[PDB]
């Protein structure tokens, strides 16, 4: 029922936008132990990933989690701009709960 | 079955036909808690969103909802033309139900 | 095993091949309730579905209706361009059985 | 550990390789009961199958098998070039045990 | 969490890093029993593989290895340059654990 990335991204503590307006840089994914995860980075320096699933990730974020993984990709591989994303503040690198994109 | 989307979508209490005619303007994906969902957007002005699975739906619409955000992104990447969406209006954004592309 | 999708056709009751030698015209998708399902229609007028799995399917085919929907929808995105369909002629519209392509 | 195609397939009873350097002629799909599979060919007029998932395989092979299908549709849509097919020849059309690409 | 995949690659015995900055030469794939696996080669001459999941892998990495093997897919298939792999150089040829893409 939120209608854009930034009224969903403020229903959460810890957060905050990042306005990106830029295909990604870097893309990275790991399958290795305890660190499987995907890392992206733009021009501007900045770092994020999507994190390794865990405890404090509820059932329904487990399939949510690996889409997010797909669009990252999908996203790198076509040079699609990325217009914002909602990260958690938190964790080294800030982790993404949302992303947007505007054509 | 039905043999149109606008057969199908009258199948149904608290729907409506959006003729689109258009690209998807902006997509957003959430993998935040509670709040696992899409919502697109059109340069009409209109919003819609593939609702959070919940009480609401049965078990044979769990597939249906993950491949209807896949279809949507996918629309989105290759500025695929949208025709019209069935939408259940008694949701905010309007919930997508069906969907159908032409050209 | 079949060759060829006329041969695999021929295997079943109330079937029929459709030759088409054209792309998809409109592709319809629904995730609302007791009806999760494709419809692909045709320039030549004709209207074809993926049914609702339910109990006229065996185990086995569950993955390949999903997997059937997951190729329409990308051979409607590339304009594919379909040669035959097998179909089943008891259903309104016909069943989608087997899809072929060629160039 | 095999290094290529050709190593891996020779470690197998009842195969061989195909060398095809051509892009796929023809990709066949089908939902139909007890004949969940996919065949295609090519312009040499060579014909191979992804058999229906059965006893004579084992757990591993069940993601395998549905990934090949994957692979083998995304080839076919991208005119890419097989290089070659690792196939059983036990089997009428001959099996696909594994393909590569070169390009 | 690491911000780059020299970091991630550190933190485990028996790896390294490769510069290919290139394109995948070959991608090759096997739904063989107990050789369902991937294996990518290069202009260079260098190869490497997607391990058949076993018991060496915990139960997180499931998902991670046949995600990679998507990655590894459609990064051959769209003719994507390889930034770095982070590879366990135990195996022959070594096993990726990680990947990197830039621009
Ligand atoms: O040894 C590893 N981790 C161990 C952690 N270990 C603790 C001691 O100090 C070194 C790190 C824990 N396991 C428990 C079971 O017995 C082995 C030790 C380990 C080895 C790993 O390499 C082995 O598995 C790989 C696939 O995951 C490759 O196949 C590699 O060739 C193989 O050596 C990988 C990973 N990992 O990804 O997390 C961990
Ligand atoms: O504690 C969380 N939620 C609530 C805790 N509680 C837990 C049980 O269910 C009811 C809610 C706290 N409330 C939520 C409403 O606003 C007031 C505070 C919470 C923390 C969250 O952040 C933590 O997990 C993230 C991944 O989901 C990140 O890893 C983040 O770094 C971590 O802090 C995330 C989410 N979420 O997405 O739903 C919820
Ligand atoms: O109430 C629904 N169905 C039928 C019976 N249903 C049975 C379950 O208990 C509620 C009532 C009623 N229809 C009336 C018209 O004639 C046919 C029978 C129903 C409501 C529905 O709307 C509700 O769920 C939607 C998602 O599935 C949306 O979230 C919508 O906003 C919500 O109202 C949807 C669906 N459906 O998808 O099949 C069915
Ligand atoms: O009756 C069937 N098989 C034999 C009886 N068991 O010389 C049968 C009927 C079939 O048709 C019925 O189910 C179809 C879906 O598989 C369609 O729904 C079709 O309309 C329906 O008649 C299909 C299949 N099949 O695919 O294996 C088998
Ligand atoms: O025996 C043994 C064996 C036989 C095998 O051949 C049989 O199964 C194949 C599919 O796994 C083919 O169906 C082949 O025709 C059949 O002989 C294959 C495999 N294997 O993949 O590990 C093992």
């Known amino acids: 029922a939120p209608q854009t990335i930034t009224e969903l991204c ?4 810890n957060t905050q936008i990042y306005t990106i307006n830029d295909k990604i840089l870097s893309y990275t994914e790991s399958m290795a132990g305890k660190r499987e995860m ?5 021009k501007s320096g900045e770092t994020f990933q999507v ?10 974020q ?3 989690i ?8 999908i996203t790198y591989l076509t040079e699609t701009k990325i217009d914002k994303l909602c990260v958690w503040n938190n964790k080294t690198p800030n982790s993404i709960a949302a992303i947007s994109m505007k054509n």
């Open 10 to 13: 403020s229903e959460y503590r």
């Open 38 to 42: 995907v890392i992206i980075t733009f």
């Open 51 to 60: 994190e390794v699933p865990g405890s404090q990730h509820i059932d329904s």
């Open 62 to 64: 487990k399939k949510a």
């Open 66 to 73: 690996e889409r997010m993984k797909d669009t990252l990709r």
